[PDB]
Design a binder for this molecule. Sequence first.
Ligand SMILES: C[C@@H](NCc1cc(Br)cc2[nH]c(=O)c(=O)[nH]c12)P(=O)(O)O
Ligand SMILES: *[C@@H]1O[C@H](CO)[C@@H](O)[C@H](O)[C@H]1NC(C)=O
Ligand SMILES: *[C@@H]1O[C@H](CO)[C@@H](O)[C@H](O)[C@H]1NC(C)=O
Ligand SMILES: *[C@@H]1O[C@H](CO)[C@@H](O)[C@H](O)[C@H]1NC(C)=O
Lengths: 25, 313, 42, 376, 50
Amino acid sequence: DIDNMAGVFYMLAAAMALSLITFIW
Amino acid sequence: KKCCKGFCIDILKKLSRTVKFTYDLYLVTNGKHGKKVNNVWNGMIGEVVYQRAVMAVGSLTINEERSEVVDFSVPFVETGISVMVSRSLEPFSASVWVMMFVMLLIVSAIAVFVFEYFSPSFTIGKAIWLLWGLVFNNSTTSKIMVSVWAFFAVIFLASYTANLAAFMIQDQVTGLSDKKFQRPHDYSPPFRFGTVPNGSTERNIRNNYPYMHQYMTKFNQKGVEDALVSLKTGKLDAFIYDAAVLNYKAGRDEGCKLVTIGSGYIFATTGYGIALQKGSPWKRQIDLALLQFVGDGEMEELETCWLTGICHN
Amino acid sequence: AIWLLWGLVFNNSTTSKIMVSVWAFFAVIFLASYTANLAAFM
Amino acid sequence: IVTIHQEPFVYVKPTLSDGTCKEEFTVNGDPVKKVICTGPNDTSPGSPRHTVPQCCYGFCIDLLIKLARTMNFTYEVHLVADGKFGTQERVNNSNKKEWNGMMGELLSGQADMIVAPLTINNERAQYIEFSKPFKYQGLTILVKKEIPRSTLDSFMQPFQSTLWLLVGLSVHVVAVMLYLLDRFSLTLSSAMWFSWGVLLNSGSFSARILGMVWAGFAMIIVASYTANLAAFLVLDRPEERITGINDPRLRNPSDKFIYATVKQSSVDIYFRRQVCLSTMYRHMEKHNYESAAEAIQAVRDNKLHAFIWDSAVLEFEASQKCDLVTTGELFFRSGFGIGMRKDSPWKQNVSLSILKSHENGFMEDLDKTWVRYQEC
Amino acid sequence: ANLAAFLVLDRPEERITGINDPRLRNPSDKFIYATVKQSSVDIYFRRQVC
Ligand SMILES: C[C@@H](NCc1cc(Br)cc2[nH]c(=O)c(=O)[nH]c12)P(=O)(O)O
Ligand SMILES: *[C@@H]1O[C@H](CO)[C@@H](O)[C@H](O)[C@H]1NC(C)=O
Ligand SMILES: *[C@@H]1O[C@H](CO)[C@@H](O)[C@H](O)[C@H]1NC(C)=O
Ligand SMILES: *[C@@H]1O[C@H](CO)[C@@H](O)[C@H](O)[C@H]1NC(C)=O
């Protein structure tokens, strides 16, 4: 479904943000 | 003076279109339809035989006692003897039950065999435990490369749970030809059947089951509504009466708590007809008009709004 | 504690742990409710 | 007496070399009553017709035997030369209404009593008197019933085949980024092995959040895999059986579900007068077949989705072959009868005897022993 | 399975599509509906014998 791609993109964005935060820490 | 309404009124109105004669109607005074009592007719027959009414229109049941005394037209409403009764793994998965249950065994066996062959931990004990704890939630290099079976495991689990969740979405006597009617003492709860006296059903069951009528008379009624309220309250186990009214009240009941027993199980599929006078000059026209109405498309509109019901499966 | 809590509720992953393992009831109830909702809201 | 060869009711079979037919027994062991049948050897026209002695038996003949025993009758059963019930045909000076078949033979004096499956219509009853019906059967809907099976036969995801490639590239990139983040304040394949073992059911701060987000990614995949299968299973029902003429599916016939009559059956005449069936006639006229046998053969060959015919034939065919199951409750019900002349003095006695037999339960026993065989 | 069945039967009721809805044709105690008194509605319903 179309919503699945939006959800997985939203999850990946949060994962990348957390990875960047823990790398810059 | 009142205005009579109903299915019979519409039938008479349709007949008057071709007959073109004035019809005056009046209600009965001698209780119900009546029967042959002391060689004296009662009700509709008692008013037709004595020339008090040339035509008899109503819910009269065709029986062996009416045809030889009076002549009626072709029946147009189906009826008969009906019974009213209140409403009371492999099918979920592995319908064949022999294919997948041995496929799992053979695939486990070949997995154990290849695990043993991968020696160049324990094949006998550890392999079975890991196989049964990997497919189900309940519970080095060679194990990783053979862990690809988890895809099939999760697919099988998903299929099983979907089948179990999707395969749960949702008669007893089967006519008078069962021993239940004739043997009320073979069951701990005594049977309580219902009937309306002074009708065509009591004599019909006398002529076929003389011994059953003795037990049948133990439970008498005064009207159809009494039987309906008894069935709703559970006072009477079953009710036997005209098939048409029982079908109508089963299709127009509240809560879909009353249904009949299949179709074609009627003891004697009969009709209603119109009891005319012996030698009356209307038998050669009324029957033709009724047959034309039935076969030319003049009955379905009445049937849709007067007889069709709900709670069908 | 965080690892065991997140590996107990979900399939993906002494005396004190056993006595607090009663949370698996709520875990399985939540998982069943989630999968039922996801299967029935489409 | 003349009778037509009707398989559910009249079993016309040739006799043996001795002139009589062999005697069989029913499931209850009772002997099968048979009467010497007289009729043409070849039903088709343009053949050297010979009135060879046949042998017919069945439910109607059993009823005739009962009537003869209870009413002092001595009869010789015949067969219809035309092979039809009887309607109006066109001949030289077409402005004259001449009957054929059973009705024509009865009006011409060839026959005196007709004990067979002849429908009761007003047009027939205008000139020929009819007796009380034996049993009431109206035309129904016949469809083919097939063993249920899942329709979700697909590979590489239901509709998004790119989903497998997407999850593969996702598990590759998450593994390579885990390997990259490992060298911070486990060399060849441990990251991929762990990713596979956490995506499937098998055995600093960056690792924790990475495992949380990848577990969340794994949960939705299996959730969607279960949800799509559940949806397919709950939509896996092929079709719902027609409950009658009021079914909305029949009211709008399409190419996906085609059904029609034969040619000019009492069915086509009835549908002609129904002005509300314009949608029916806009589609059924292009699917008519020459014969009912051809129509039912096409239905068996998955050509016609539904077939409409009298219940006396469709129910018998369904009982004989389980590949077809009769549907629909009832619509345009009719009954059978006995064709007798207007001056026949047997009308009242025949009606009384038929009513007595119907009330005595003989009709139900005959239906059990002659109509309903090996129920599916 | 029981939760899934309850969820798929969790629909309270289906909105009436008109006078041809079978629910209205057989009024019961669970779904009661009536007019006021003698609205052009009652006059119209009087002539409807069905
Ligand atoms: C209109 C159709 N036949 C009805 C029918 C079916 C069966 Br079974 C028996 C019948 N016995 C009749 O005397 C008759 O008149 N009709 C009968 P058809 O002619 O279009 O096939
Ligand atoms: C039935 O008829 C009898 C007379 O034979 C009468 O006494 C009795 O009241 C009648 N019952 C009903 C319910 O009409
Ligand atoms: C008529 O039937 C009766 C049976 O009641 C029989 O006794 C009698 O011999 C029969 N007569 C003829 C002429 O068949
Ligand atoms: C009709 O049956 C009665 C006996 O029920 C008999 O007396 C009478 O002769 C019969 N009629 C004819 C025309 O055979």
